């Protein structure tokens, strides 16, 4: 499902950004600004399909297209970008706070119902596929129901409308964190993470819409609608958009075939593919090439059933893809596959096929790991019910080794090193790998997008150490390595 996650950033202007309010820090203006800046950076690196707008409930002198009193409209709904980063840097730090004092000032009178009015206007402004719409708000004023009851009633009515409209609002601890003490009564219409928001984890791109769906033409009679998808991706280099080094102007690199001799623009027609082999240049053509690659229609033709016992580590290829059952023109796909999964204890003998990716391209043997409905107790469908597309190699997929068959050592070595490795058991964490080049690259991009003094080099969990395992375990591994002249040359 495509859709722009619109997010609004409601930050106070009177004191909730400026009063300690049962705390001792500085004005929450600066911390809130840095928090939202961090999340903007996180989106820029991780999500540029989500619109953002910042609003200041409370305004001495209105900066608002709505022109309503106590409305300060800084940034309109739009995807994250550098102009907004500069916009917030104007109000970043205590220098930014005193700026805020300069053009409009703090202690600003508020208009809550009008704030809901104008943010509703902003939500109405969008013209695109919307995935989510959230109001993000911090306030030291956890319960300013001390206002006129008419304003509170109208604000609650507007909240009922907007959540009825589907608009979502978030107020999160700024005065009395934890214990539900925060929002002493503004809990009425709203029903921690500052560390994450400042942490601004980024560079996370994920599937948004369905793609690459096919059918299980298992025999010449039966087909079963399915869909092929990925969750393991190879991180790319971001596109080098050739810009004029002076004027930042893009490049129309006009690349074509041609003739080195007669100065004419050649075409694939008046040219032919060829293969210089032996004594014969083996000629071909573009459609000839396609046909030589054109084998059969895309889909899954069942070639057999193999137990999940022949599969071994050497039986491995490119990272596996996934198949989910689909019912667009094959009734019972999901039903029959549910039967397959319930009888998957016996269906360790998984399906065998020579999968054809698309037309004009050949099929290839790819095994299918039966994915169960592994729904977690917290209701996370890890490995959704389907099949993992582990790819069956050919004799092509081989680069042989020598055969200097090595023999086992004395069992005391095995036992002592088992004690070593289990004593030196690294805490398992699947979501623990970030590429230092990748991370440092993100940091260069974000830092050399502003005038940052330096891009930080992210010390990743992927970096091995020298003493952390040498204090969790110690040098007893080397002392155990009792053989003369250990591989520590």
């Amino acid at each position: 499902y495509s859709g722009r996650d619109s997010l609004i950033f409601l930050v106070d202007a009177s004191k909730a950004m400026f009063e300690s309010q049962s705390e001792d820090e500085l004005t929450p203006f600066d911390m809130s600004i840095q928090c939202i800046q961090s999340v903007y950076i996180s989106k820029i690196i991780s999500s540029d399909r989500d619109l953002l707008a910042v609003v200041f409930y409370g305004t001495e002198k209105d900066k608002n297209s709505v022109n309503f009193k106590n409305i300060y409209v800084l940034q309109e709904l739009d995807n994250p970008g550098a102009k907004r980063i500069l916009e917030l840097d104007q109000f970043k730090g205590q220098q930014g706070q005193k700026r805020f004092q300069d053009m409009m000032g703090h202690g600003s009178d508020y208009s809550l119902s009008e704030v809901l009015w104008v943010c509703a206007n902003l939500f109405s402004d969008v013209q695109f596929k919307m995935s989510h719409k959230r109001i993000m708000l911090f306030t030291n004023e956890d319960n300013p129901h001390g206002n006129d009851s008419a304003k509170a009633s109208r604000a609650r009515t507007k909240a009922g409308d907007l959540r009825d409209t589907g608009i979502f609002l978030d107020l999160m601890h700024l005065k009395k964190p934890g214990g539900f003490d925060i929002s002493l009564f503004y809990r009425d219409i709203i029903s921690s993470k500052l560390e994450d928001l400042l942490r601004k984890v980024r560079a996370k791109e994920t599937r948004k819409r369905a793609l690459s769906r096919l059918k299980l033409k298992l025999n010449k009679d039966i087909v079963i609608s399915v869909g092929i998808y990925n969750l393991v991706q190879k991180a790319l280099k971001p596109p080098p958009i050739k810009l004029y080094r002076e004027t930042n102007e893009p490049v129309k690199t006009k690349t074509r075939t041609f003739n080195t001799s007669t100065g004419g623009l050649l075409l694939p027609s008046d040219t032919k593919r060829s293969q210089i082999y032996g004594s014969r240049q083996i000629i071909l053509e573009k459609e000839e090439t396609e046909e030589l690659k054109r084998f059969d229609d895309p889909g899954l033709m069942l070639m057999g059933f193999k137990p999940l016992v022949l599969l071994k580590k050497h039986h491995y290829l490119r990272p596996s893809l996934f198949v989910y059952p689909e019912e667009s023109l094959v009734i019972g796909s999901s039903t029959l596959f549910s039967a397959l999964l319930i009888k998957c204890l016996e269906k360790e003998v998984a399906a065998l096929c020579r999968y054809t990716p698309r037309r004009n391209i050949p099929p290839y043997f790819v095994a299918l790991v039966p994915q169960e409905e592994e729904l977690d107790d917290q209701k996370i469908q890890v490995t959704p019910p389907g099949f993992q597309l582990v790819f069956l190699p050919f004799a092509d997929d081989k680069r042989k080794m020598p055969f200097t068959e090595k023999i086992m050592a004395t069992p005391e070595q095995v036992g002592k090193m088992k004690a070593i490795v289990e004593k030196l058991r690294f805490t398992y964490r699947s979501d623990s790998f970030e590429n230092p080049v990748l991370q440092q690259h993100f940091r260069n991009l974000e830092a050399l997008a502003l005038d940052l003094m330096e891009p930080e080099q992210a010390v990743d969990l992927t970096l091995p150490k020298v003493e952390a395992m040498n204090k969790r375990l110690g040098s007893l591994v080397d002392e155990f390595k009792e053989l003369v002249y250990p591989p520590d040359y």
């Binding site: 810009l243 490049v251 129309k252 075939t257 694939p268 060829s274 293969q275 680069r399 090193m417 699947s430």
Partner: protein, 163 residues
């Protein structure tokens, strides 16, 4: 060919190892050389990349006055080749260092990544260390232990975490 490295973890481990590819496609060597249909002479064929500009006449300019932009957020950040060449850093050398240990039961065949199978060889010039590594292989097998290794493909490539 030999991928020489010393598998070094902590303050004590350093095992000389030469890595080799086990699963690897043999791709076609001689390619579909496109030749003129009427002369079959690729030598008489030109492949020019006319780096034109966004002009009516699209004035061509070499990369001399061209920078590599990057659509950073709702904007483009241009990085010159040296600009994007100093910002970089990767594990220099044929790096291969294990991060730690865990049971292979945690991971599944449906949780693999990487395109081939890379049989890393035993200790180099140390048969005692080689048989010790064989015993360590057995130790890993007994405990389902995994050698989660940070692996720079070489000096020229970035690090790649693996097992």
């Amino acid at each position: 060919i030999h991928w020489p490295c010393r598998l070094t973890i902590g303050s004590n481990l350093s095992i000389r190892i030469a890595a080799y590819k086990s699963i690897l496609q043999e791709r076609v060597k001689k390619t579909w050389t496109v030749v003129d249909a009427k002369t079959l002479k690729k030598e008489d064929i030109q492949k020019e990349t006319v780096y034109c500009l966004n002009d009516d006449d699209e004035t061509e300019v070499l990369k001399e006055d061209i920078i590599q932009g990057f659509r950073y957020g709702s904007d483009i950040v241009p990085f010159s080749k040296v600009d994007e060449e100093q910002m970089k850093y990767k594990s220099e050398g044929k790096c291969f260092s294990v991060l730690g240990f865990c049971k292979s039961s945690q991971v599944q065949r449906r949780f693999f990544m990487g395109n081939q199978v890379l049989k890393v060889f035993a200790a180099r010039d140390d048969e005692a260390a080689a048989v010790a590594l064989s015993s360590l292989i057995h130790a890993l097998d007994d405990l389902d232990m995994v050698a989660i290794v940070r692996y720079a493909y070489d000096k020229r490539a970035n690090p790649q975490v693996g097992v």
